[PDB]
Design a protein around this ligand. Structure first.
Ligand SMILES: *P(=O)(O)OC[C@H]1O[C@@H](n2cnc3c(N)ncnc32)[C@H](O)[C@@H]1O
Ligand SMILES: [Mn+2]
Length: 336
């Protein structure tokens, strides 16, 4: 959760026909600034899209007309915008607006000291349930870092191969076995089985609980539940369903590699537990800029008549992964 970090102004490029602003590159992001607010190499606090910034017209007067009520507080949600034809994401403010950060270094996470919180879309009806417990501390959650935030790592991984999957727009769902317990989790909690709980229903329907009893291993099956009344049902499914994208090895505290995961999926298939998988595209040998990766994000989703939310890249050893969200998708879906 690094919503607000100290970053470096990259290339600064004019915005044709708008002399009072210019375009500022910050890592893989592009962001509109007041002309002369920065020059290349200056440091500033960068606030990512999905940041929620509490109302304050002394420090954030550029946000005044966009204040909303959210989770009981007045503040502004930073979102993708289109300025003079120019794609703008985030807020970039010079260090001298933050006297309390005078001692800080480039790259520092200042999210807590600045009080920034995360905006998120409302959760869907039957995906909140009765909670049975914490999300298990022995299972990794499924968050992915954005390619825009991975400029050095993208170049450090030149030559490496990644599994490329379609990023489905649903909700994260984890089904797991640890010794004598099998549980079903949403994104942040473990859930009780009820007749009305969507996650449990998808787990029973595809027999993945039976499949985990078959495999007899401490594994977390991690995937996206999508379909009707889930986040606008982009794929236009009937009903709801689970699509696997990861298997976490609980005992070894690590994810299965894509080839390990594909074998384990094939064996579940071959034994009558057909777990579906997020769409898998051609493996990609990485030799790209973040801009080029982002240019691949748009395209066909699971439903090939709809434009997907983006891509997720998983290195073949399973130990480096990131997401490339489609900016066309973010312009089309203002609730994202
Ligand atoms: P998104 O920006 O919501 O952040 C990552 C989450 O995306 C979901 N997800 C959908 N499809 C995939 C694939 N193919 N791989 C990994 N994750 C995926 C998960 O719920 C993530 O937590
Ligand atoms: Mn999502």
């Amino acid at each position: 959760r690094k919503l607000a970090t100290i970053r470096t102004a990259g290339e600064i490029t004019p915005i044709a026909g708008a002399e009072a602003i210019e375009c500022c590159h910050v890592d893989g992001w592009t962001c509109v600034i007041k002309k002369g607010e920065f020059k290349q190499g200056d440091r500033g606090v960068y606030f990512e899209i999905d940041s929620f910034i509490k109302e304050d017209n002394d420090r954030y007067p550029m946000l005044s007309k966009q204040v909303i009520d959210y989770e009981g507080q007045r503040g502004t949600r930073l979102r993708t915008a289109r300025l003079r034809g120019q794609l703008s994401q985030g807020l970039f403010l010079p260090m001298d607006r933050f006297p309390e950060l005078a001692s800080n270094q480039v790259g520092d996470d200042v999210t807590e000291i600045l009080g920034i919180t995360k905006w998120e879309p409302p959760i869907s009806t039957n995906l909140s349930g009765e909670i049975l417990g914490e999300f298990p501390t022995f299972i990794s959650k499924t968050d992915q870092e954005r390619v825009q935030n991975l400029i050095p790592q993208i170049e450090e991984n030149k030559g490496q191969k990644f599994e490329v999957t379609v990023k489905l727009d649903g909700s994260s769902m984890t089904v797991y076995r640890k010794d004598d317990h099998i549980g079903v989790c949403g994104r942040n909690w473990e859930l009780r089985e009820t007749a009305t709980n969507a996650q449990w229903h998808a787990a029973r329907r595809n027999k993945m609980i039976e499949g985990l009893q078959f495999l007899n291993r401490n594994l977390a099956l991690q995937g996206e539940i999508i379909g009707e009344s889930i986040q606008g049902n982009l794929e236009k499914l009937k009903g709801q369903d689970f699509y696997l994208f990861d298997i976490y090895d609980i005992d070894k505290a690590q994810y299965l590699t894509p080839i390990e995961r594909q074998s384990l999926v094939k064996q579940l298939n071959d034994n009558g537990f057909t777990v579906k998988h997020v769409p898998i595209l051609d493996d990609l040998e990485l030799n790209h800029t973040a801009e080029q990766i982002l240019a691949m994000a748009d395209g066909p989703s699971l439903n090939k008549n709809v434009k997907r939310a983006g891509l997720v890249f998983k290195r073949l050893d399973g130990k480096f992964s990131f997401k490339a969200i489609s900016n066309a998708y973010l312009e089309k879906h203002k609730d994202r």
